[PDB]
C-alpha cells in the first residue's frame, strides 16, 4: 500500500509540473461564438414511456431510441416516420446503439443481457440475432466497433468486448471501483473511455486490453462521456453540476464547465462536429450549450417537460436530437 501511495503522489506531481498554463489563459483571445438560437425543427412522437438512450445512424438520417415500454423504435428523422418498432423481452431498457453499417441495432438494460437485432432480415422484419450474456449487472451503455464486434459497459464495474459470431466475451476490462455508467469509442476505434460511479474516468486500449490512464476530476459519479472529434480529448458529465474536459496527452483536466445557478446533475454530453460546442443535457428540464474552448455558455435548449436523458450530435453535424423522460424526441438545429 505504501508503494501505491508513492506512485499516486508521483503521478500527481508529474501532472502538476506538466501544467504550464491553463486552457482559459491560452483561449482568451479567441472570439466567442456569441448567443446561439436553436429551435425544435421536428418532434418525434409515439413512445409510451420515458426515453433513456438514443444513437444516430451513420447515414445521419436514421436514429434508434429506447423506452421503458419495451419498444425500440427506429425513426426517419427527415420524414418523421417510423421505419421500425422492435418489441423487447425486458421492459426495462437503459441503453441502445446503432451499428455503423446500419444493419444491426443493439439493446440492453436491467435484463443483464445485450440484445442485438438484425434489421436486414427479409423473412422476418426484426429478430434477435444474439443474446449476449455474462454480465452480472445492468448494461449502462453499448457501442459498436463494427458489424461483428461490440463493447458494453455494465454495472459489474467491468467493460467487456464481445464477438458477435461466436457469442462470448473476447476481452474484459476491470479496474473501476463503482458501476460503469457510460462508454464512448474513439474515432479510430482502437481506444475508448468509460465513466464510472467511482468519480474516475479511465482510458482503455481495445487491442491490448489493459487500462492506460485514469483521470480523477470531480467527486460525484460520471453519467455521460464523449470524445472530442479530434479523438485526443473527452468531456465528462457528473451528478455534480460540474462538466469537465480532459486531455489524453496532458493526462489531466483542461477546463471545467459549471455555473452558480445550476445545481442539478448532467445526464448526457456530446460535442459538435468541429468541437467548438459542448452540448450537455441536465437533470433540469432544459439543455445547455457550452463553448468548449472558453467555458462560456452559448445557448440554452428548453422545451422538455421532464429531465433530458439522451443527447447526440449527428455525424455531419447538421442536427442535435435530445430524448427526455417526456417520451418525446426533439431534433434541433
Amino acid at each position: 500500500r505504501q508503494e501505491a501511495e508513492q506512485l499516486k503522489n508521483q503521478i500527481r506531481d508529474a501532472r502538476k509540473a506538466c501544467a504550464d498554463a491553463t486552457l482559459s489563459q491560452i483561449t482568451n483571445n479567441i472570439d466567442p461564438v456569441g448567443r446561439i438560437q436553436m429551435r425544435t425543427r421536428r418532434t418525434l412522437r409515439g413512445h409510451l414511456a420515458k426515453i433513456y438512450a438514443m444513437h444516430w445512424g451513420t447515414d445521419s438520417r436514421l436514429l434508434v431510441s429506447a423506452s421503458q415500454d419495451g419498444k425500440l423504435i427506429i425513426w426517419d428523422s427527415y420524414t418523421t416516420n417510423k421505419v421500425h418498432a422492435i418489441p423487447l423481452r425486458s421492459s426495462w431498457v437503459m441503453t441502445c446503439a446503432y451499428a455503423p453499417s446500419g444493419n444491426y441495432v443493439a439493446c440492453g438494460g436491467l435484463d443483464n443481457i445485450c440484445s442485438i437485432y438484425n434489421l436486414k432480415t427479409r423473412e422476418g422484419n426484426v429478430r434477435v440475432s444474439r443474446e449476449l450474456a455474462g454480465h452480472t449487472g445492468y448494461l449502462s451503455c453499448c457501442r459498436f466497433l463494427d458489424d461483428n464486434q461490440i463493447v458494453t459497459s455494465s454495472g459489474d464495474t467491468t467493460c467487456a468486448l464481445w464477438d458477435i459470431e461466436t457469442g462470448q466475451q473476447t476481452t474484459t476490462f476491470t479496474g473501476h471501483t463503482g458501476d460503469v455508467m457510460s462508454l464512448s469509442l474513439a474515432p479510430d476505434t482502437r481506444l475508448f473511455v468509460s465513466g464510472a460511479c467511482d468519480a474516475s474516468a479511465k482510458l482503455w486500449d481495445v487491442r491490448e486490453g489493459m487500462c492506460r490512464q485514469t483521470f480523477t476530476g470531480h467527486e460525484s459519479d460520471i453519467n455521460a462521456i464523449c470524445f472530442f472529434p479530434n479523438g485526443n480529448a473527452f468531456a465528462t458529465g457528473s451528478d455534480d453540476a460540474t462538466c469537465r474536459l480532459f486531455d489524453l496527452r496532458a493526462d489531466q483536466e483542461l477546463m471545467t464547465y459549471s455555473h452558480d445557478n445550476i445545481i442539478c446533475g448532467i445526464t448526457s454530453v456530446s460535442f459538435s462536429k468541429s468541437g467548438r460546442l459542448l452540448l450537455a443535457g441536465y437533470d433540469d428540464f432544459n439543455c445547455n450549450v457550452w463553448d468548449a474552448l472558453k467555458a462560456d455558455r452559448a445557448g440554452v435548449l428548453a422545451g422538455h417537460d421532464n429531465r433530458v436523458s439522451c443527447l447526440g450530435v449527428t455525424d455531419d453535424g447538421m442536427a442535435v436530437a435530445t430524448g427526455s423522460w417526456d417520451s418525446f424526441l426533439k431534433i434541433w438545429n
Partner: protein, 54 residues
C-alpha cells in the same frame, strides 16, 4: 493482498508515460477548432436552402 499488488502494478503502468505541456495540447485543440469551424452546421447558421430539416 493480491488485489493490492495488482493495483500497485496498474499504478506503475500509468505512471510511466510521456506527457506534453498543456500549452501544446491547448494549442492543438484551438487549431483543430479553428480549422474545422468552416464545416460545422451547428456553430454557424446554415442557409435554409441547405438545411435538410427545415
Amino acid at each position: 493482498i493480491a488485489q493490492a499488488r495488482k493495483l500497485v502494478e496498474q499504478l506503475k503502468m500509468e505512471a510511466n508515460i510521456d506527457r506534453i505541456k498543456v500549452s501544446k495540447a491547448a494549442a492543438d485543440l484551438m487549431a483543430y477548432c479553428e480549422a474545422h469551424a468552416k464545416e460545422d452546421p451547428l456553430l454557424t447558421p446554415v442557409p435554409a436552402s441547405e438545411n435538410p430539416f427545415r
